[PDB]
Ligand binder design. Structure first.
Ligand SMILES: CC#CCn1c(N2CCC[C@@H](N)C2)nc2c1c(=O)n(Cc1ccc(C#N)cc1)c1nccn21
Ligand SMILES: CC#CCn1c(N2CCC[C@@H](N)C2)nc2c1c(=O)n(Cc1ccc(C#N)cc1)c1nccn21
Ligand SMILES: *[C@@H]1O[C@H](CO)[C@@H](O[C@@H]2O[C@H](CO)[C@@H](O)[C@H](O)[C@H]2NC(C)=O)[C@H](O)[C@H]1NC(C)=O
Ligand SMILES: *[C@@H]1O[C@H](CO)[C@@H](O[C@@H]2O[C@H](CO)[C@@H](O)[C@H](O)[C@H]2NC(C)=O)[C@H](O)[C@H]1NC(C)=O
Ligand SMILES: *[C@@H]1O[C@H](CO)[C@@H](O[C@@H]2O[C@H](CO)[C@@H](O)[C@H](O)[C@H]2NC(C)=O)[C@H](O)[C@H]1NC(C)=O
Ligand SMILES: *[C@@H]1O[C@H](CO)[C@@H](O[C@@H]2O[C@H](CO)[C@@H](O)[C@H](O)[C@H]2NC(C)=O)[C@H](O)[C@H]1NC(C)=O
Ligand SMILES: *[C@@H]1O[C@H](CO)[C@@H](O[C@@H]2O[C@H](CO)[C@@H](O)[C@H](O)[C@H]2NC(C)=O)[C@H](O)[C@H]1NC(C)=O
Ligand SMILES: *[C@@H]1O[C@H](CO)[C@@H](O[C@@H]2O[C@H](CO)[C@@H](O)[C@H](O)[C@H]2NC(C)=O)[C@H](O)[C@H]1NC(C)=O
Ligand SMILES: *[C@@H]1O[C@H](CO)[C@@H](O[C@@H]2O[C@H](CO)[C@@H](O)[C@H](O)[C@H]2NC(C)=O)[C@H](O)[C@H]1NC(C)=O
Ligand SMILES: *[C@@H]1O[C@H](CO)[C@@H](O[C@@H]2O[C@H](CO)[C@@H](O)[C@H](O)[C@H]2NC(C)=O)[C@H](O)[C@H]1NC(C)=O
Ligand SMILES: *[C@@H]1O[C@H](CO)[C@@H](O[C@@H]2O[C@H](CO)[C@@H](O)[C@H](O)[C@H]2NC(C)=O)[C@H](O)[C@H]1NC(C)=O
Ligand SMILES: *[C@@H]1O[C@H](CO)[C@@H](O)[C@H](O)[C@H]1NC(C)=O
Ligand SMILES: *[C@@H]1O[C@H](CO)[C@@H](O)[C@H](O)[C@H]1NC(C)=O
Ligand SMILES: *[C@@H]1O[C@H](CO)[C@@H](O)[C@H](O)[C@H]1NC(C)=O
Ligand code: NA
Lengths: 728, 728
């Protein structure tokens, strides 16, 4: 008999998915790491050479965390002493290695505790952030030029984001943007002076006698937000003037009237920059297109070039307004926007004309614009077979919009329905990354003729290994609720027999624009639960879910904790109606937003669920951050949406937890969903006399991702689900 | 068939022990609160009068927390707006009611947020502390005189203790001591300037958007301690024009050489005060005897009147050097000290002579000195039948030490083996309080011929109720280890059958000077476990336990987490070999020091215990406070006892928890045993991949004593023990 996919298989990563992570260095070459050696590959022929031998830094004296080769290939940035901060941020030490001289640079070194470092996009200039101020080095061995003097820990951030902008706006720590040829350095400045601090204990190693109090400027819903300013400095003037001026570009009057955000920065040309601003009430955004005026040395944003993007049914964008993709001359751009039917499609704009032209349309959505050449625009969409959970690459002819080719749809239609892509520098080549429903498959292609050059990684070693394992299967389908198709997936036990009654675990995210029903192949906890424990692990995309139009996505506008919660309960009732589910053994679990939904479901009094697990849940919207929460909820004021903020807490449903078995889990150093959130749930349960199971994770954050805590949490949850389902 | 004593009976206090709490106001009368009315009783006859009608404050507009009648009976202090702080500390608002003129005083009121208030011992003067400064009111309607001006929140404490002195030295918030007739007011001043702060989150009600950080000056072992100064003010010479002069009494030179504590303040006469000082290395203490000098207005402490108390085997006193009991002229005193055999007995000292004379002797100990007349000294000891867990009242004839009479031994030997006493003002009468092995019994006696005047409360109503319940029994016996007898108790299920095998729960404290095997009658969680669940609840007093001499008590000197842990394992090993114990079902549980011991036992790798519960445990001695920890451990420095501090942690035993089921519980707002202690245990268990059960209690402190959390914790622990013992 074949073994199953066990909990230890998952926790020890016995069955490893092979990747093919390349780094394009030009229009025809990429870097790839093979046995710690950095190899340079010719895309056209597949032949390689050792770019940098694995032995090069044996006598360095520090474990190198990562590297970054300068665009001109003259230098290599070596990252070490990596200390993680939030989701994207960290600090590190850096050394620069001169590739020509084959020597490490020992003078004018990047300082220790550097927050961010980036090469210019051409050549080898560097911009870095140290002690919240920006510095620029024209040459790696030469002194830096200081750009800002206002940087102050927890107060003024120059060229780096504060907590909320990193997490919710930019999805990056960096707040600097070099112009295409590196002449200008644009940057944002955040002022957190009046932003309140979240404070929590950090216990550290057992040697630490007194716990440390971590204090982070974090605006919770309705609190004082950081303010922002935007500047542009001419780096070519640094060696000629004592103190080069940072020219401010002010937000438009329509934004200055109240609280707002800087939400996008995109250079159009060497002398033209676009900026998108978003009002704190996130249903109104403004794009400014600003040109360098050589005579005044100023940046001017013509009102004739200003573009408004607004929503009457919800917020702007999926999580924020989309980025524009400028044509080479910078006189026009493409941008994903919601059409009149509420479907996200590519619109083509002239910079000084307000009405745009849609180049795509249909009851499906464009996911992202991937590359733009003088003749073609390349994008990813879920158009294929009307499957919102699938992803394919398309090519549209710019001189004829009726000419749309699907580049990936038919490559391996059984194995591959979810693609991502990586284009070379001027889009001459593209790597396709298939992530499911079969094993991930990485292929290289030439853009000149769309021909498949070679298979880079097919995961054949893993396929051989899995043949000896009783693997679960995955069913992806839909149910029709009120004449609308709603997609679901099920991880089915091996030898799934529809005449048998199986226990069911509902795996929930269900946040706005979430998608849990897709074609991706995963080896995770659900793989184990279905394979070894014979549990069906189901997920459902209800109202509020993404990639299916605004009528679905905006259904939860101003009403989080309503339809998306009700639709999970309804999904479980629909799954019971299918005949292969034991109705006495239905459980629900989720993390973060999934934890909030799990808890809301468990407190609903539905009687559908026996048990559930909430990991790092939100419990009350006033505890979560301003940017994310207010996007869907508006402000927690009597004049706005306070009544709904108060009506959608987990705590108010405490009495209903008497009907279920609940497991509540949270990391004590969670800077994102504060431990406070679960501390308030537990107190409300204790207050009504509800028994439940709990687990805190000392010094773990939102990811509970340290090697030991990851194994501990999944082991603890596995025992809980098994006990709930009477499984030995 | 009769009911058992259930978990709800324990949680809802179905079966209540009646008390008889009286307050002596003279040598012949006492106050007793009956039906919210305050009565005055004549001790000789038992007749009473209403002192204060319950209706007097029906229109007060505030709920009265407590009352305090002035010594002369002219005024009543009304306490309201009570806000608990630590174990003893709190703030409240106060009003004074004139009993003669039948009116509330509205002039010069005691301020709100008052920290401590006390009447003088005679008359009706008041001393109070507000904003850390001392104030004196000569008359209730008159303005206060400000005594101190240096009071500063968390820094300077005048007349009130800081955290560590409150918890570990004085067992009180008060640091004020009126002279016997109220002329002088002595006070301590604490300086916490350089004491580090423990910081922890407080979540508060769900309405609080950002958690509060609580910051408390708390010296952990080896950290900077508070400093102390002592002063005496003459309250008869205060002026409305001039600031009060406080006379400082400095510590002796043997204390000033290094860190030290003020550990006892006891007035001897109207013009003589005794002070005890303790070195930070708590095996050396000095008593100073200080006399007022009428000519100079100074307090002089003659070197010839100094008394040294030291220990070569351990620390001084049970928890601190004992209090002296001065004679009427203050020329001599009686004090409990450890004799040459290591047994605590009464020594008689002359104020100006070094050698004291022991008035009691034997292999048993004096618990406390209770009253002193020119002819007799009254004390409690465990002499009777050589039972260290029993307590009786004795009197010793001061002119002939061979004449010792037991006053309580034979009153009711079957019902009463554990007594406490309350004497009237000049010891003319005494109230005996029997607390076990039978139901509590309160009696009143006259000292002249030791007549048993009357029964005050016999709990016959509870006895009638308990007749219909299947109550557990208590067995008190001993085991012999290395020629020494060590006592244990077992709470045995009703209808106990020695031919049956019962699961056993070891209930542990086992800290230095602990005593868990005694003759006290209790209605607690153990009563329910034995009565309803048929579990034997055992407790054992091994090495380090009290009231049996220093050979046993000092056995754990500089070695916490050694013999007391080994001895609990040895006792359970011996119990597991008894015919009526199921060796497959032995559990252990404890709170605080008992939580530490439970955890150390569970991590010992003994294999005797299936499971256990640690509530608010200490996990590493460096995390606990200086005063308690260093008393037994010395300093955590390489030159002193750092190696033992490092090898006595729970965290180092984490791998050994693989073979046990463990439940770890802690309140998040524990200011005493910081949540940090359990946060480090859980992290060590996660680090070694050991699964365990946990429960945090949001905003609960060391007591986990709110009505809802107390019910929740005992409910959660009951489910855990029942699951462990395969009980339905
Ligand atoms: C509270 C909250 C929230 C919503 N949130 C956001 N957004 C957009 C990005 C920034 C972020 N602050 C908010 N992205 C995600 C969530 C979320 O809950 N989950 C569910 C989830 C989370 C963690 C794990 C794990 N491990 C598993 C499922 C998730 N899975 C894949 C992506 N996301
Ligand atoms: C950490 C530690 C410790 C030692 N500690 C101290 N001392 C002397 C007084 C001041 C204090 N800081 C230290 N007194 C006690 C303890 C102790 O652990 N328990 C066991 C226990 C504690 C709480 C509960 C409850 N609920 C049950 C048992 C206890 N039961 C009755 C009195 N004590
Ligand atoms: C991939 O192969 C090509 C062709 O064999 C290499 O290109 C160069 O070809 C010239 C012919 O004029 C040879 O003299 C050189 O060896 C090559 N130039 C360089 C700069 O190396 C090419 O280099 C190969 N690429 C890799 C990454 O190995
Ligand atoms: C960051 O914003 C704060 C206010 O949120 C600014 O601080 C004010 O600065 C002015 C001087 O121009 C003072 O007169 C005010 O007292 C300050 N207010 C507060 C609340 O501190 C600050 O200047 C901004 N800093 C930068 C570098 O823009
Ligand atoms: C470079 O120029 C900036 C901008 O004028 C100077 O920043 C000013 O610094 C002084 C403090 O000495 C203050 O008066 C201003 O509030 C600052 N303004 C801004 C926008 O930061 C800066 O100090 C200059 N650096 C040098 C070396 O002269
Ligand atoms: C990259 O772009 C900048 C901006 O267009 C170029 O700088 C301009 O170059 C022209 C020379 O052809 C001059 O007329 C301007 O004075 C320059 N402007 C500024 C603001 O510096 C720059 O030369 C380009 N760099 C490279 C390396 O090609
Ligand atoms: C208890 O009874 C005695 C009498 O046996 C009371 O003593 C008296 O005191 C009151 C005034 O307070 C007078 O009425 C009598 O003249 C006293 N008689 C004697 C013999 O002293 C006493 O008041 C009662 N005590 C209480 C507290 O009610
Ligand atoms: C104790 O607190 C109360 C309430 O703050 C004070 O009582 C007065 O009550 C009303 C409202 O309850 C306030 O408007 C007044 O300011 C209060 N002042 C006076 C002078 O009556 C009270 O004064 C406080 N007591 C002391 C002794 O300070
Ligand atoms: C309380 O104790 C502190 C010492 O912890 C005394 O403060 C001063 O301490 C600093 C160092 O913290 C020294 O630089 C000074 O010389 C000390 N004395 C003075 C007069 O500044 C502090 O004075 C004490 N306070 C009281 C009211 O006794
Ligand atoms: C309490 O004791 C004090 C001190 O013994 C008494 O005060 C002394 O009283 C006599 C008057 O009879 C004077 O000779 C002294 O000068 C006083 N000493 C001080 C230090 O003030 C006081 O009378 C007693 N109080 C009561 C109410 O009995
Ligand atoms: C108080 O206890 C201390 C610690 O046990 C005793 O310390 C002596 O002095 C040093 C500590 O710095 C050690 O080197 C010695 O080993 C100790 N002497 C012994 C164990 O005899 C100190 O003697 C104690 N005081 C009394 C009065 O016994
Ligand atoms: C970084 O830290 C190390 C260790 O303290 C030090 O020797 C070195 O000079 C530092 N590097 C820079 C660039 O300051
Ligand atoms: C933005 O949102 C607020 C709250 O829903 C609303 O009153 C306002 O009209 C909205 N703007 C648009 C363009 O719908
Ligand atoms: C008493 O002392 C305080 C504090 O030092 C001072 O401010 C006040 O002026 C003094 N009053 C008199 C009457 O000396
Ligand atoms: Na009698």
């Amino acid at each position: 008999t074949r073994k199953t996919y066990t909990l230890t298989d998952y926790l020890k990563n016995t069955y490893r998915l092979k990747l093919y992570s390349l780094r394009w260095i030009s229009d025809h070459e990429y870097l790839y790491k093979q046995e710690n050696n950095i190899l340079v590959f010719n895309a056209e022929y597949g032949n390689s050479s050792v770019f940098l031998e694995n032995s090069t830094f044996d006598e360095f004296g520090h474990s190198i965390n990562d590297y970054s080769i300068s665009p001109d290939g003259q230098f290599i940035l070596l990252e070490y002493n990596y200390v993680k901060q939030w989701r994207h941020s960290y600090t590190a030490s850096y050394d620069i290695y001169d590739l020509n001289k084959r020597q490490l640079i020992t003078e004018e070194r990047i300082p220790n505790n550097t927050q961010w470092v980036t090469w210019s996009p051409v050549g080898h200039k560097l911009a870095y952030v140290w002690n919240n101020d920006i510095y620029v080095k024209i040459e790696p061995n030469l002194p830096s030029y200081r750009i800002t003097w206002t940087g102050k820990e927890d107060i003024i951030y120059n060229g780096i984001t504060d907590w909320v902008y990193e997490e919710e706006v930019f999805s990056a720590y960096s707040a600097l943007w070099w112009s295409p040829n590196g002449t200008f350095l644009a940057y944002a400045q955040f002022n957190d002076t009046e932003v309140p601090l979240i404070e929590y204990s950090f216990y550290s190693d057992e040697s630490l006698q007194y716990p440390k109090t971590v204090r982070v400027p974090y605006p919770k819903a309705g609190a004082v937000n950081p303010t922002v300013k935007f500047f542009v400095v001419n780096t070519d003037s640094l060696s000629s003037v004592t103190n080069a001026t940072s020219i401010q570009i002010t937000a438009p009057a329509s934004m200055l009237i109240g609280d707002h955000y800087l939400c996008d920065v995109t250079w159009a040309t060497q002398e033209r920059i676009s900026l998108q601003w978003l009002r704190r009430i996130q249903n109104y955004s403004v794009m400014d297109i600003c040109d360098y005026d050589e005579s005044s040395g100023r940046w001017n944003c013509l009102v004739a070039r200003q573009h408004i993007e607004m929503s009457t049914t919800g917020w702007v964008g999926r999580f924020r307004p989309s980025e524009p993709h400028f044509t080479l001359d910078g006189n026009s751009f493409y941008k994903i926007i919601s059409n009149e039917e509420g479907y996200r499609h590519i619109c083509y704009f002239q910079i000084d004309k307000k009405d745009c032209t849609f180049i795509t349309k249909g009851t499906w959505e464009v996911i992202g614009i991937e590359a733009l050449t003088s003749d073609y625009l390349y994008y990813i969409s879920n158009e294929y077979k009307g499957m919102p959970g699938g992803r394919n690459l398309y090519k549209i002819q710019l001189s004829d919009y009726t000419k749309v080719t699907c580049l990936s749809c038919e490559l391996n239609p059984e194995r591959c329905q979810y693609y991502s892509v990586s284009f070379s520098k001027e889009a001459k080549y593209y790597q396709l990354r298939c992530s499911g429903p079969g094993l991930p498959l990485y292929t290289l292609h030439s853009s000149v003729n769309d021909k498949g050059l070679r298979v880079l990684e097919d995961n054949s070693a893993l396929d051989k290994m899995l043949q000896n394992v009783q693997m679960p299967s995955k069913k992806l389908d839909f149910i029709i609720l009120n004449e609308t198709k709603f997609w679901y997936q099920m991880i089915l036990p091996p030898h799934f027999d529809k005449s048998k009654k199986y226990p069911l675990l509902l795996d929930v995210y269900a946040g706005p624009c979430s998608q849990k029903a897709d074609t991706v192949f995963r080896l995770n906890w659900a793989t184990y639960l279905a394979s070894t424990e014979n549990i069906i692990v189901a997920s459902f995309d209800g109202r509020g879910s993404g990639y299916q139009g605004d009528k679905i996505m905006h259904a939860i506008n101003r009403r989080l904790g309503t339809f998306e919660v009700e639709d999970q309960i309804e999904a479980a009732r629909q799954f019971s109606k299918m005949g292969f589910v034991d109705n006495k053994r239905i459980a629900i679990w989720g993390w973060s937003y999934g934890g909030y939904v799990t808890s809301m479901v468990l407190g609903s009094g539905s009687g559908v669920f026996k048990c559930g697990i909430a990991v790092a849940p939100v419990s009350r919207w006033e505890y979560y951050d301003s940017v994310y929460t207010e996007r869907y909820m508006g402000l927690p004021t009597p004049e706005d949406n306070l009544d709904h903020y108060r009506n959608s807490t987990v705590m108010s449903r405490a009495e209903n937890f008497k009907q279920v078995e609940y497991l509540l889990i949270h990391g004590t150093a969670d800077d994102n969903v504060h431990f406070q959130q679960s501390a308030q749930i537990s107190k409300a349960l204790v207050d009504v006399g509800v028994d439940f199971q709990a687990m805190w994770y000392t010094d773990e954050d939102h990811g509970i991702a340290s090697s030991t805590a990851h194994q501990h949490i999944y082991t603890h949850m596995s025992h809980f689900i098994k006990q709930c389902f009477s499984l030995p």
